Every structure is written in C-alpha cells, then in structure tokens.
Amino acid sequence: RRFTSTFYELFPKTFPKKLPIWTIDQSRLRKEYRQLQAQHHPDMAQQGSEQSSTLNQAYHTLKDPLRRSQYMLKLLRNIDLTQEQTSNEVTTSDPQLLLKVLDIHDELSQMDDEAGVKLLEKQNKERIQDIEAQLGQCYNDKDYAAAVKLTVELKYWYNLAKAFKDWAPGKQLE
C-alpha cells in the first residue's frame, strides 16, 4: 500500500530488486551514491523535501549497521526503534541486559588508565560485530522479533562506543 519511495529504491544499481536487505554491498552503494551526485544537473530538483528523505540521509542510513537495522524494521514491521517509547517496551522484559549495560558503564568509570579503557572498548567492538552477524541471520530467516531485540541492544553498545571515545584520564573518585 506504501507508494512513497524507500531508501533502497533510491539506489537501483545497488538493489536491482528494490527491496530492503541487510547484506548491502557497501562498495557498490558508495559508488552509486557518488555517481548519482555526478549525474545531478543544476536544473534538476533533488530527491526529498527535507533532510530526513534526501539521498544523503538514504546513503548514511544504509551504510551504518544500527541505522540500517532500525530502518529495515520501520519498513518491514512498522516499528520505529529510534522512539524511546517503542524501544522501552522491548527491554522492559529484559533486566539482565539492562544490568549488564549499566555494569559496563560502571566498569568504565572505575578504569584507572587508558589501557583499561581500550580493553573495554575492544570487548564492546566484538559485541557489536557479533550482533551484526546475528542480525544478518535474523533478516535472512525473517526472524523480525529477534532482530528488534538485537537492534535495541545494538543501540546500547553504540552509546558505550561513544563513551569510550569521550573518556579522559584523571577523573576524581570519592
């Protein structure tokens, strides 16, 4: 029933079938995004009327794993995990995860030097890669319920990834 275009539909060379998929050839997507920009003549109108629906938004959404997963679940299951309301319903049922996240935040603040922070950051990068591999399986198998849970989880590890970057030495304890 949708007649508006999807971001997959804006890259027809990268997605000949025009349907949402997880395993994107990122080299082909990058090449097509550059090509579409090369093909833009100053008489033409650009695609999309606001930042959220431009080719630039489409490209950066499909490039990044978290955004690509949230975007797929929007198109395929009508669920918008960028909304605090939707995502809280998911993890309400899952205290163990929330505790684990929060304990990593606490471990971070106990680290006495950059070496201990780098270790936690390497371990977080590994959780992220594993989730990306698990998501490819869930999408291949149409396990959308599992992909929702993993995508809400993936957002917490992205948030920690940024905390590791923002870390500085020498915070006072007490």
DSSP class of residue 141 equals T
Q: Are residues 5 and 64 in the same domain?
A: yes
DSSP class of residue 83 equals S
Residue 21: give the domain boundaries: 1-89
| Amino acid (one-letter) located at 82 | T
Q: Structurally, how many domains does the chain consist of?
A: 2
Q: Are residues 77 and 12 in the same domain?
A: yes
37 and 51 in contact (C-beta within 8 Å)?
no
Q: Are residues 75 and 117 in the same domain?
A: no
158 and 66 in contact (C-beta within 8 Å)?
yes
- What technique was this entry resolved by? X-ray
- The CATH number given to whatever domain includes residue 129 is 1.20.1280.20
Q: Are residues 94 and 26 in the same domain?
A: no
Q: Which two tokens stand for residue 51?
A: 């930042």
Report CA torsion sign: 101, 107, 109, 111: negative
Cα distances (angstroms) measured from residue 17 to each of 51, 88, 108, 156: 25, 34, 44, 32
